[PDB]
Write a protein that binds this ligand. Structure first.
Ligand SMILES: CCCCCCCCCCCCCCCCCC(=O)OC[C@H](COP(=O)([O-])OCC[N+](C)(C)C)OC(=O)CCCCCCCCCCCCCCCCC
Ligand SMILES: CCCCCCCCCCCCCCCCCC(=O)OC[C@H](COP(=O)([O-])OCC[N+](C)(C)C)OC(=O)CCCCCCCCCCCCCCCCC
Ligand SMILES: CCCCCCCCCCCCCCCCCC(=O)OC[C@H](COP(=O)([O-])OCC[N+](C)(C)C)OC(=O)CCCCCCCCCCCCCCCCC
Ligand SMILES: CCCCCCCCCCCCCCCCCC(=O)OC[C@H](COP(=O)(O)OCCN)OC(=O)CCCCCCCCCCCCCCCCC
Ligand SMILES: CCCCCCCCCCCCCCCCCC(=O)OC[C@H](COP(=O)(O)OCCN)OC(=O)CCCCCCCCCCCCCCCCC
Ligand SMILES: CCCCCCCCCCCCCCCCCC(=O)OC[C@H](COP(=O)(O)OCCN)OC(=O)CCCCCCCCCCCCCCCCC
Ligand SMILES: CCCCCCCCCCCCCCCCCC(=O)OC[C@H](COP(=O)(O)OCCN)OC(=O)CCCCCCCCCCCCCCCCC
Lengths: 111, 96, 69, 172, 80, 317, 71, 96, 344, 112
């Protein structure tokens, strides 16, 4: 077999934790929809994940800008949102249901 | 790997000299129920790493007969002691 | 109806210890947070990922949005 | 704690059988099975399937091993003895006990000796060999027990047991 | 026969309570329209991942945007 | 500091079985119109620390006509499974998060009868030879009265873990939708763990014949000890299953306070039954399992299969 | 995304376990570098010994036996 | 003799739990699912007496997918390629 | 007792159908598992202490012969994982297969399963039910057939008639004389099975007929050979002529139809340039005839009907399907140009 | 790796207290009459353990009712499923298949 080099690796890796990744996570996937759904056809409809390395970076690079937008515009209700849901045990969604609209007070409106 | 040689060495708990002999026949029916778990385990190691997803209902059903089988065989071993009081495999009357 | 209450009050305390002890070990060993549970093998995959990227060697320290800016 | 925790269990399980495979006076025969049944369940409780191991305690070790000891009183009630206090027990205990080590001795302790005894090596972490991970469905092993597709299976095994009582409702 | 359901319930009301719960248990799934919702709930719980399809001629429905009015009616549960 | 947690659970519970032997008789005393242990305490409270040292001074004979390796192995397996069963049990956090641990209770409650079959055999003759054979026979028959109606609530819980068994009861106190099963849940553990009305096990048992009949106070000191460890453990298992308390993650302190108060109340009933009712005369003991207990348990089993379907109320897992 | 961050791990793992194998020994009674065990050239999944080779010291134990016997 | 009732009238008595790639209740395949579907494609209308000596390629790799016999030997001999030269340098790779 | 005697008896043949209706080694395990569960009551019915000490010698012989079969399944579970009933893909499996199953059909090794059971069961009435257990594993060797070692299946079959022959010249008890020459008629059919496995079933269908009609003749009183004397001049002299005809037919003499198999089965055994193999066996079944002659020298020559006891009454047993057995078990040799094109 | 050190603590504390309570004052310096008086109130008892039929059928009957609760065991896992008319009508079969095995045996139990 033949493999790609040590280059086409070492991309800008999203270094976040598990709960802050699961924090937004819901607004995330349902509005990008060009690089990622096509990446599934690049993995399901043809196999051998050694050919399919372009769109693995197309899903990654746009996700870099998703968190870059949320830091500049509104991060004050965001950081307290994944604070309470990180108060752990299964990461339930019915505990911080009260504090969910204070995050989404402007995500529908501001941006 | 070596997790199959042990246990395929442990399948030799039949060993036929001690599958009907010597007396106290309960010692022989012992290894008949103890020959299971050398089949219940040797199946379970193979269905589980190689994700078959369906054949793992077969080790559940492997116990269900061999329990009912040996329970039947244990009924008759009372009947040999109901007539005597001792099982003692060196009882033999009907020749061959 | 009086002297039986001290007999209760030594037995009854003796089960208040192990509930308070274990609840203040997991919350204390992992720094003021509950302990991550993992029933399904997908749920393990988040922790073992998070150990590789959190800070040193732990599944109980956070990274935050401000980490990657 | 080691990588060799599976291999160190199974040798006990092999020596569990040689405990009762020879002739131990059938009340220590129970102490050959319950030892092996737990140690054997120590193997099966790896690899993912824990429901399939914990049933071996309930239906085998909980069900059959009472009745196997609920007899040996109503029959075979002679004056009991212990194994290894006689000459016919110890003469067969050592016979496989060497091969219980001798099979281990050269399967891989040599480098490769030579062609026929080196295809299967001990260790290392490829005993499980299940990477990578899966999904949030089950182990699985979890979505396997089915009152779906198999119906001909259950309609026999249900009905095979129903004649199991009627055979024993007679002679006794 | 109408006394037999009252002159054994004066002697052994033990197994009579068993048949009364054995019956009226097989009967009811053929009765209420709450069932087949028990199969309708149980069908639209996604375990696996939805792989997409490809456009080739058809184009039957359901374009690249999911929040368009594209897919079937499983949104009666949020109103439920 | 995981090792300091295990010792923080074995040691504070040996007091609660030693300070139950004292409340065994004060509660049983005011039913007779008489005070508790009056003179040594002052209130009694210092009785068991004096009543423990006497047993380990008094000479632990072995019987001359006894066996050796069986007689001193059953008290090893007595305290083993009497204390190992306390592990997977949430209050509010368990020591161990087993995926399926409700079944592990029956994996622990099954092997306890395999010591009675030893000790009745291991020592000696007829007052424990046949007299313990008919004590294994009652304890085996009350698993099928037990394991069915333990499964009969799991069709409504959803799965096998115990964290879901507190989640499903946040608004119900589940003794109400299953109160016929809750009756036969009680009497099973009242007879399986060898207690006062169904009492051919211990000392009411022809009033002379027991498994305690031969153990001098050396090895005897655990048998009683270990045994009293089951009876506060089926009570800690009933009150996590039917009468479930409320869990708050921000305040775990108020869980245990409202929790230990409840298992103590059910533990009173094992004392409060003994001062009312006589025995059952071994036939009628087992005459009411098959003929009388069992066919109702299948009846509600078929009831609890169809009712989650014909309500469209499937529990999620 | 969690898929596309996982497949990048093993190709790094395959490259270092081959490139730091191809510099170990080049014997004429030795191996070719870049071969497969199978005739068919198609991307089969790797194995535990493929990813984690003869190292087997600490972290390989936590990889296999991590989900089992506890969080 | 093999009557084969279940081919006449279309019930599956079993037929589903037989092979490694049949149904998969929630579509989780095995470790060698790719070679089952490939090998059964070989011998379908072939009468299996010429299939033993003609196909012979799609079966052998599938046997070696399942046990990993020579893959473990090419791995084991690398422990003897190096690792007598523990003391003769070439740590390879340095951590990490 | 009467209705439950059918439900036990009904499921015996329901156990063996699943052996034949199966594409899956798990179901053929269940198939003749429950046969070994549902024969044990039929051994018992009148509760005599030989019968209880005979079924227990029957039992564990067919527990191990069960148990090695499941060992043979799990070996080729590891190899290629297909569970259809076909060739077994491993010579360590098929070797363990065939000489496990050789106990249920009992061949010449795995010896005394056949005399020690059938002798002295007080139910001599039937015990025609030991024709199903010769019929279930033969339905398994029809599929496994193109995977054997060709030496073991002959060495169990060359020993079969050489030791099933010698074993019974030293007998009087006519249940043993029926128990013997039941290994011999398992010797002729599995000597052929590697070569054209049909024209094996021809021998089996003949063997069911000729043996079933032998037991029905025996159900007047007959226990021992000396009792086989005292019914010519007492019960019916037409019984003596009938019991002559089937034995001389079952010996293989060409005026009757037990010569129908061999005559056809050597048409297959040579045509495969194997000549020293049939000439051994064809001369071996000759002292399989010295059972039958010296049995016919008892009843058909008025050998001492003494101890005057008159049966002045008629007979009312149930000789079911008896009027049509020695009319297809004797006279069929002209009427079968192709029985082996119906059964093929 | 504590499961497995969650119980080997519990058994080595169990076998600790046995030998300290039993075996340590078993080496004490008293007179210790070893005469055959150690058996209580059944002095000689020169007999073998006799067979009791009504206490054998209790063993076998339980064993055949114990098997098909393990068939009945994955009923809560058989809820989140596909086709459920099959799942309901097959689950009701085994219980009735357990129930008939009562009623036949129920016409003859004996003094159990
Ligand atoms: C048989 C029809 C069953 C389906 C009915 C559909 C639901 C109908 C609602 C109930 C209607 C009334 C039912 C009639 C009951 C008559 C039975 C009777 O009287 O018992 C007589 C006899 C009583 O004889 P007995 O004199 O020995 O009384 C002893 C009864 N016990 C043990 C309770 C003290 O009972 C039987 O013969 C059957 C006993 C076995 C029952 C097995 C229970 C099945 C478990 C659930 C499945
Ligand atoms: C039809 C299938 C439903 C399953 C039911 C299974 C039997 C349940 C027990 C029925 C109890 C009825 C008790 C009163 C019967 C009246 C007494 C009488 O006249 O005898 C009739 C009896 C009812 O049986 P019995 O149980 O009442 O007592 C008969 C005595 N023994 C058991 C020794 C045979 O009918 C028969 O004897 C024929 C049936 C044979 C045995 C039953 C198994 C097969 C069932 C038929 C298929
Ligand atoms: C061929 C398929 C296999 C058939 C072989 C016979 C198996 C049938 C099993 C039941 C037969 C039985 O047990 O009857 C004995 C029983 C003996 O039972 P019994 O009389 O001793 O005990 C019953 C007690 N009472 C009466 C109180 C209930 O009856 C007979 O003796 C005659 C009845 C039928 C005998 C068999 C007839 C069929 C045999 C010829 C088959 C021809 C096949 C041709 C192939 C081409
Ligand atoms: C007289 C003194 C001499 C005797 C001393 C020894 C006595 C020991 C007796 C102890 C008997 C207890 C055996 C109980 C076995 C059941 C253990 C079990 O099932 O644990 C539950 C768990 C199941 O896995 P899971 O729930 O899915 O984990 C969550 C993953 N997210 O499983 C796990 O969490 C991890 C599974 C692997 C853990 C290691 C294997 C457990 C068994 C080790 C001991 C072997 C048994 C010894 C023989 C028993 C004899 C009675
Ligand atoms: C159509 C809609 C659906 C319909 C649903 C209807 C629901 C109905 C629910 C009924 C099922 C639950 C009731 C359980 C049955 C009771 C058990 C039983 O049957 O006992 C019968 C027993 C036999 O004796 P008997 O028949 O009376 O004959 C002697 C008379 N001389 O006689 C007895 O009474 C024995 C009494 C018990 C024996 C033990 C007593 C010891 C003390 C126990 C005290 C327990 C107190 C409560 C337990 C704790 C509760 C939290
Ligand atoms: C004319 C029939 C015979 C004369 C009347 C019947 C007399 C009789 O009952 O004897 C039957 C005899 C059997 O011989 P046996 O038993 O030794 O004599 C004692 C009889 N109590 O012999 C028998 O008849 C038994 C039946 C033998 C088979 C039928 C042969 C009888 C001849 C009549 C049928 C003719 C047509 C069939 C043969 C055609 C040949 C081309
Ligand atoms: C060569 C051509 C192919 C041959 C195959 C033909 C099929 C079988 C034909 C024989 C049928 C036998 C028969 O009809 O019964 C004979 C006889 C009953 O005679 P019956 O007329 O009823 O007189 C009653 C007076 N009380 O029977 C009796 O005396 C007792 C009653 C039992 C009835 C016989 C039941 C069997 C009928 C079905 C046979 C199918 C199996 C074939 C087995 C034999 C095969 C050779």
């Amino acid at each position: 077999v033949e493999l790609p080099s040590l280059e086409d690796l070492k991309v800008q890796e999203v270094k976040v934790s598990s709960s802050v990744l699961k924090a937004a996570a819901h607004h995330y996937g349902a509005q990008c929809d060009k690089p990622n759904k096509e990446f599934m056809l690049c993995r399901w409809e043809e196999k051998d994940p050694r050919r399919c390395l372009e769109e693995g970076k197309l899903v990654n690079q746009c996700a870099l800008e998703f968190f870059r937008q949320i830091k500049r515009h509104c991060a004050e209700p965001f950081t307290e949102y994944w604070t309470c849901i990180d108060y752990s045990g299964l990461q339930l969604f019915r505990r911080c249901r009260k504090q969910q609209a204070q995050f989404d007070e402007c995500v529908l409106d501001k941006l | 790997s070596m997790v199959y040689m042990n246990i395929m060495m442990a399948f030799t708990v039949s060993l036929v000299g001690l599958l009907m002999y010597r007396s106290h026949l309960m010692s022989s029916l012992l290894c008949l129920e103890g020959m299971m778990l050398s089949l219940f385990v040797m199946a379970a190691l193979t269905i589980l790493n190689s994700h078959f997803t369906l054949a793992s209902m077969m080790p559940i059903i492997l116990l269900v007969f061999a329990a009912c089988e040996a329970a039947l065989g244990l009924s008759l071993l009372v009947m040999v002691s109901n007539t005597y009081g001792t099982d003692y495999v060196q009882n033999l009357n009907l020749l061959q | 109806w009086f002297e039986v209450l001290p007999g209760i009050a030594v037995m009854g305390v003796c089960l208040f210890i192990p509930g308070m002890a274990t609840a203040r070990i997991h919350r204390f060993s992992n720094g003021g947070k509950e302990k991550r549970v993992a029933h399904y093998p997908y749920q393990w995959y988040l922790m073992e990922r998070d150990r590789r990227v959190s800070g040193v060697n732990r599944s109980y320290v956070s990274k935050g949005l401000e980490n990657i800016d | 704690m080691m990588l060799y925790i599976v291999f160190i269990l199974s040798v006990i399980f092999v020596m569990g059988f040689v405990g009762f495979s020879s002739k131990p006076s059938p009340i220590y025969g129970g102490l050959g099975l319950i030892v092996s049944g737990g140690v054997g369940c120590g193997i099966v409780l790896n690899f993912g399937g824990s429901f399939l191991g914990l049933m071996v305690f309930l239906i085998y070790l909980g069900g059959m091993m009472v009745v196997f000891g609920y007899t040996t009183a109503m029959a075979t009630e002679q004056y009991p003895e212990i194994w290894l206090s006689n000459k016919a027990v110890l003469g067969a205990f050592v016979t496989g006990l060497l091969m219980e080590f001798f099979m281990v001795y050269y399967v891989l302790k040599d480098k490769e000796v030579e062609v026929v005894f080196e295809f299967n090596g001990l260790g290392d972490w490829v005993i499980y060999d299940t990477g990578d991970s899966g999904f949030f469905s089950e182990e699985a092993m979890g979505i396997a027990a089915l009152y779906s597709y198999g119906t001909w299976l259950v309609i026999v095994t249900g009905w095979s047991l129903l004649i199991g009582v009627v055979v024993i409702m007679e002679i006794t | 026969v109408a006394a037999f359901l009252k002159n054994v319930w004066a002697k052994e009301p033990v197994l009579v309570a068993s048949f009364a719960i054995a019956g009226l248990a097989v009967i009811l799934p053929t009765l209420s329209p709450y069932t087949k919702y028990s199969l309708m709930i149980n069908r639209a719980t996604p375990y696996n991942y939805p792989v997409p399809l490809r456009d080739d001629g058809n184009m039957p429905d359901v374009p690249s945007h999911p929040q368009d009015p594209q897919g079937p009616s499983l949104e009666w549960l949020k109103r439920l | 500091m995981f090792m300091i947690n295990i010792l923080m659970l074995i040691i504070p519970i040996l007091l609660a079985v030693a300070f139950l032997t004292l409340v065994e008789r004060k509660v049983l005393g005011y039913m007779q119109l008489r005070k508790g242990p009056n003179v040594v305490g002052p209130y009694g409270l210092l009785q068991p620390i004096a009543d423990a040292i006497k047993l380990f001074i008094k000479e632990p004979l072995r019987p001359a006509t006894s066996s050796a390796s069986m007689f001193i192995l059953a008290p090893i397996m007595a305290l083993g499974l009497a204390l190992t069963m306390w592990i997977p049990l949430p209050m509010p956090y368990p020591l161990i998060n087993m995926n399926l641990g409700v079944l592990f209770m029956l994996a622990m409650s099954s092997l306890a009868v395999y010591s009675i079959l030893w000790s009745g055999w291991a020592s000696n003759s007829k007052y424990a030879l046949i007299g313990a054979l008919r004590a294994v026979a009652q304890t085996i028959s009350y698993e099928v009265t037990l394991a069915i109606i333990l499964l009969s609530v799991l069709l409504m819980s959803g799965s096998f873990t115990l964290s879901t068994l507190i989640t499903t009861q946040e608004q119900m106190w589940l003794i109400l939708p299953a109160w016929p099963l809750a009756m036969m849940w009680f009497i099973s553990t009242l007879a399986e763990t060898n207690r006062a009305p169904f009492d051919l096990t211990e000392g009411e048992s022809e009033l002379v014949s027991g498994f305690n009949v031969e153990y001098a106070a050396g090895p005897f000191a655990l048998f009683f000890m270990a045994e009293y460890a089951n009876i506060i453990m089926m009570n800690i298992f009933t009150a996590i299953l039917f009468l479930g308390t409320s869990h708050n993650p921000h305040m775990p302190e108020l869980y245990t306070i409202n929790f230990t108060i409840k298992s103590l109340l059910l533990t009173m009933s094992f004392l409060w039954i003994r001062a009312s009712y006589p025995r059952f005369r071994y036939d009628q003991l087992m005459h009411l399992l098959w003929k009388n207990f069992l066919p109702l348990t299948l009846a509600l089993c078929m009831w609890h299969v169809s009712l989650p379907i014909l309500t469209s109320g499937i529990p999620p897992q | 995304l969690l898929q596309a961050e996982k497949d990048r791990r093993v190709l790094q793992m395959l490259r270092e376990n081959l490139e730091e194998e191809a510099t170990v020994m080049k014997d004429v009674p030795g191996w070719k570098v870049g071969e497969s065990v199978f005739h068919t050239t198609r991307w089969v999944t790797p194995m535990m010994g493929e990813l984690y080779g003869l190292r087997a010291s600490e972290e390989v134990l936590s990889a296999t036996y991590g989900f089992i016997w506890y969080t | 003799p093999f009557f084969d009732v279940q081919k006449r009238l279309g019930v599956d008595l079993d037929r589903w739990m037989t092979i490694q790639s049949a149904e998969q209740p929630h579509k989780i395949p095995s470790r060698c699912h790719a070679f089952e579907k490939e090998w059964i494609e070989c011998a379908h209308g072939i009468g299996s007496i010429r299939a033993e000596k003609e196909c012979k390629i799609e079966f052998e790799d599938f046997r070696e997918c399942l046990l990993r016999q020579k893959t473990m030997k090419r791995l084991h001999a690398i422990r003897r390629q190096r690792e007598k030269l523990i003391k003769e340098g070439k740590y390879t790779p340095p951590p990490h | 007792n009467p209705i439950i005697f059918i439900i036990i008896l009904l499921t015996i043949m329901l156990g063996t159908i699943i052996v034949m209706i199966s594409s899956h080694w798990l179901l053929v395990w269940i198939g003749f598992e429950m046969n070994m569960l549902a024969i044990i009551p039929i051994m018992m019915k009148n509760h005599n202490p030989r019968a209880t000490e005979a079924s227990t010698k029957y039992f564990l012989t067919q527990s191990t012969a069960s148990m090695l079969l499941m060992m043979a399944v799990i070996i080729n579970l590891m190899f290629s994982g297909q569970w259809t009933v076909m060739k077994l893909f491993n010579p360590m499996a098929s070797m363990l297969m065939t000489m496990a199953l050789a106990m249920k059909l009992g061949m010449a090794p795995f010896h005394f399963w056949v005399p020690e059971v059938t002798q002295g069961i007080p139910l001599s009435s039937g015990l025609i039910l030991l024709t199903w257990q010769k019929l279930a594993p033969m339905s398994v060797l029809y599929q496994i057939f193109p995977s054997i070692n060709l030496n073991l299946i002959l060495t169990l079959s060359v020993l079969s008639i050489l030791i099933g022959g010698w074993g019974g010249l030293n007998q009087t008890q006519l249940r043993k004389i029926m128990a013997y020459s039941s290994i011999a008629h398992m010797g002729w059919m599995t000597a052929v099975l590697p070569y054209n496995p049909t024209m094996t079933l021809l021998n089996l269908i003949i063997y069911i007929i000729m043996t079933s009609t032998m037991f029905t003749m025996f159900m007047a009183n007959s226990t021992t050979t000396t009792l086989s004397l005292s019914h010519t001049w007492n019960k019916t002299p037409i019984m003596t002529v009938l019991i002559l005809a089937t034995l001389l037919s079952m010996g293989g003499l060409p005026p009757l139809s037990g010569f129908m198999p061999k005559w056809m089965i050597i048409q297959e055994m040579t045509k495969n340039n194997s000549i020293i193999l049939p000439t051994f066996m064809a001369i071996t079944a000759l002292l399989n005839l010295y059972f039958y002659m010296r049995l016919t020298y008892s009843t058909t020559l008025t050998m001492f009907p003494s101890t005057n006891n008159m049966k002045m009454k008629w007979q009312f047993p149930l000789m079911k399907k008896m009027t049509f057995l020695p009319t297809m078990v004797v006279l069929s040799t002209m009427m079968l140009p192709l029985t082996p094109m119906l059964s093929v | 790796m504590n499961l497995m050190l969650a119980l080997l603590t519990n058994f080595t504390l169990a076998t600790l207290l046995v030998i300290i309570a039993f075996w340590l004052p078993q080496l004490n310096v008293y007179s210790e009459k070893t005469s055959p008086y150690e058996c209580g109130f059944d002095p000689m008892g020169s007999a073998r353990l006799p067979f009791s039929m009504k206490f054998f059928l209790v063993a076998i009957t339980f064993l055949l009712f114990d098997l098909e609760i393990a068939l009945l065991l994955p009923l809560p896992w058989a809820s989140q499923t596909a086709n459920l008319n099959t799942m309901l009508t097959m689950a009701l079969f085994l219980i009735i298949l357990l129930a008939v095995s009562l009623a036949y045996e129920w016409t003859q139990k004996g003094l159990e």
